[PDB]
Amino acid sequence: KYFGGFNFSQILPDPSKPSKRSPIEDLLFNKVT
Amino acid sequence: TMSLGAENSVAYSNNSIAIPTNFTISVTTEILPVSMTKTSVDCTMYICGD
Numbered sequence: 116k117y118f119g120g121f122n123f124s125q126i127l128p129d130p131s132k133p134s135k136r137s138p139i140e141d142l143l144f145n146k147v148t
Numbered sequence: 149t150m151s152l153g154a155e156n157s158v159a160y161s162n163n164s165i166a167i168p169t170n171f172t173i174s175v176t177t178e179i180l181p182v183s184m185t186k187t188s189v190d191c192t193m194y195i196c197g198d
C-alpha cells in the first residue's frame with residue numbers, strides 16, 4: 116500500500132472489522148439512522 | 149447471491165506501466181425518449197355521455 120507517499124488508509128476498506136467498510140464509511144453509517 | 153462481476157487484481161508497482169498497442173472502434177447504441185402520446189379528454193362525454 117505504498118502509493119508514493121499518499122495514505123489512503125482512511126478511504127480503503129478495513130479487513131479487520133467484520134463489515135468491510137472504510138473508516139469514513141463507518142462514521143457515515145453510524146450517524147444517519 | 150448475485151455476483152458483482154469478475155475479480156481482477158491489477159498489479160501496482162512504482163516502476164511498471166501498461167501501454168496499449170492496438171485499438172478498436174466500438175459503435176454502441178443509446179435509446180432516449182423524446183415525446184409521448186398527446187391525449188385530449190372530453191369532460192362531458194367521459195363523465196356522462198348521451
Ligand SMILES: *[C@@H]1O[C@H](CO)[C@@H](O)[C@H](O)[C@H]1NC(C)=O
Pocket residue numbers: 122123124125
Ligand atoms: C495512515 O494514516 C493513519 C492515521 O493517521 C496512520 O495511523 C497510519 O500510520 C498511516 N499509514 C501510513 C502508511 O503512514
Ligand SMILES: *[C@@H]1O[C@H](CO)[C@@H](O)[C@H](O)[C@H]1NC(C)=O
Pocket residue numbers: 117161162163
Ligand atoms: C516500490 O515500493 C516498494 C514498497 O515501498 C519498495 O520496497 C520498492 O523498493 C519500491 N521500488 C522503487 C523502484 O522505488
Ligand SMILES: *[C@@H]1O[C@H](CO)[C@@H](O)[C@H](O)[C@H]1NC(C)=O
Pocket residue numbers: 169170171172
Ligand atoms: C490490431 O487489431 C486488429 C484486429 O482488431 C488486427 O487485425 C491487427 O493486426 C492488430 N494490429 C496490431 C498493431 O497488432
